[PDB]
Amino acid sequence: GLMQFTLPVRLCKEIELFHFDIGPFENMWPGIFVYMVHRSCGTSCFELEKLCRFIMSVKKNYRRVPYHNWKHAVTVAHCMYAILQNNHTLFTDLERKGLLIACLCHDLDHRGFSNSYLQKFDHPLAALYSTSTMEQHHFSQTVSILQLEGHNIFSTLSSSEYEQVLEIIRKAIIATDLALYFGNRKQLEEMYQTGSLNLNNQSHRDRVIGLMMTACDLCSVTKLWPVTKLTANDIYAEFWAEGDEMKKLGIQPIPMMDRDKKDEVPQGQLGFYNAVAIPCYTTLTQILPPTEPLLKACRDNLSQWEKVIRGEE
Ligand SMILES: Cc1nc2c(NC(C)C)nc(CCc3nc(N4CCCC4)nn3C)nn2c1C
Numbered sequence: 658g659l660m661q662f663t664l665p666v667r668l669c670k671e672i673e674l675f676h677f678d679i680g681p682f683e684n685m686w687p688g689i690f691v692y693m694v695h696r697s698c699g700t701s702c703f704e705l706e707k708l709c710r711f712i713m714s715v716k717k718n719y720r721r722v723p724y725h726n727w728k729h730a731v732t733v734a735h736c737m738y739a740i741l742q743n744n745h746t747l748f749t750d751l752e753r754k755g756l757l758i759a760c761l762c763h764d765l766d767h768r769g770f771s772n773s774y775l776q777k778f779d780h781p782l783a784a785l786y787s788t789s790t791m792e793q794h795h796f797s798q799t800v801s802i803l804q805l806e807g808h809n810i811f812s813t814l815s816s817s818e819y820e821q822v823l824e825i826i827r828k829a830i831i832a833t834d835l836a837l838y839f840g841n842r843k844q845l846e847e848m849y850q851t852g853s854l855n856l857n858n859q860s861h862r863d864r865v866i867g868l869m870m871t872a873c874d875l876c877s878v879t880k881l882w883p884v885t886k887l888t889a890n891d892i893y894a895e896f897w898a899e900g901d902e903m904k905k906l907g908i909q910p911i912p913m914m915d916r917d918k919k920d921e922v923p924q925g926q927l928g929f930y931n932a933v934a935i936p937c938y939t940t941l942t943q944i945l946p947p948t949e950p951l952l953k954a955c956r957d958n959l960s961q962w963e964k965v966i967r968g969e970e
C-alpha cells in the first residue's frame with residue numbers, strides 16, 4: 658500500500674525523457690514498468706500482486722527473437738509513458754490504465770515473421786485472422802493472460818468499464834499493424850488542417866491513440882544515435898531471416914528482407930524515415946505539441962543515416 662517502486666537516480670531522471678533506453682538488465686524491466694504504471698496511473702490503479710503476476714506471464718509469452726521480444730514490449734510501453742506524462746490532462750483514467758498494458762502486450766507471442774509471411778506460408782493464424790493477422794493474435798494472447806487465475810488486474814472495474822478498457826486495448830493493439838497507419842495518419846492530417854479534429858468524438862480519440870501506438874511502436878528511430886543504429890541491426894536480423902524463409906518457399910523477398918541487399922541499408926533507412934517515421938511524428942506533434950522531442954530525435958537520426966550515405970559515418 659505504502660510501497661513505491663524507486664529507481665536509481667540516473668534512471669529516475671532519464672526515464673521521464675522520450676529517448677530513455679531501458680538498458681541491458683532484463684531483471685530490472687518489470688520494476689521499470691511498475692514504476693511507470695505507478696506514476697502515469699497511480700499506486701491504486703492495480704493490485705501489486707496481480708500486476709506482478711501479469712507482467713511475468715506477459716514476459717513468458719514473448720519469444721527469444723532478435724527484435725520482437727520482451728525488451729521491445731517494455732521499450733514501446735516507456736514511449737507511451739512519456740507521451741502520457743507530457744499530456745497529463747488529455748487522457749481518461751481508463752486510457753491511462755489501458756494503454757501501458759496495451760503497449761506491454763502489443764506483440765505478445767510474436768514469431769519474428771510479418772503478416773505477409775504467415776499468409777504465404779499458410780500458417781493456421783492466417784485462416785483464423787485474414788487481416789492484421791499477428792495483431793488479432795496479440796490481442797487474443799492478451800485476453801488469455803487476463804483470464805488466468807490471479808491475473809485479472811482489471812477486477813476492480815465495473816462490467817462496462819472492463820469492456821471499455823478491453824476495447825481501448827483491442828483498438829490500440831490492432832493499430833500497431835503499420836498497413837493501417839498510412840490511412841489513419843492521412844485522415845488525422847486532413848481532420849487537423851480542416852479544424853474538424855474533436856477529442857470529444859470517440860472515433861477521433863481512437864485515431865489519435867492509434868497514431869500514438871505507431872509512434873511508440875517505431876520509437877527505436879527516436880533514440881540516441883548508438884541505440885538507433887544497434888536496434889536497426891536487430892530489426893534487419895529478423896527481416897533477413899524472413900527473407901531466407903521466403904526464398905525457401907520459392908519467393909524473392911521484398912528488398913527490405915533480402916540479406917543480399919545489406920549494402921543498401923542506409924538508403925532503405927532513408928526511405929523509411931521519409932515515408933513512415935517523419936510523417937508519423939510530424940502529425941503526432943501537430944495533435945499533441947508536447948511530443949515534439951520524438952520528432953526532433955527522429956530528424957536527428959535521419960540526418961545520421963544521411964551521414965552514413967555520404968561516407969562521414
Ligand atoms: C522502427 C523501425 N521499423 C522499421 C521497419 N518497419 C517495417 C515494418 C516497414 N522497417 C525498416 C526497414 C526499412 C527499409 N529498409 C529497406 N531496405 C534495406 C535495404 C534494401 C531496402 N527498405 N525499407 C523500407 N526499419 N525500421 C525501423 C528502424
Ligand SMILES: [Mg+2]
Binds near residue numbers: 763791833834
Ligand atoms: Mg506488432
Ligand SMILES: [Zn+2]
Binds near residue numbers: 729733763874
Ligand atoms: Zn511492436
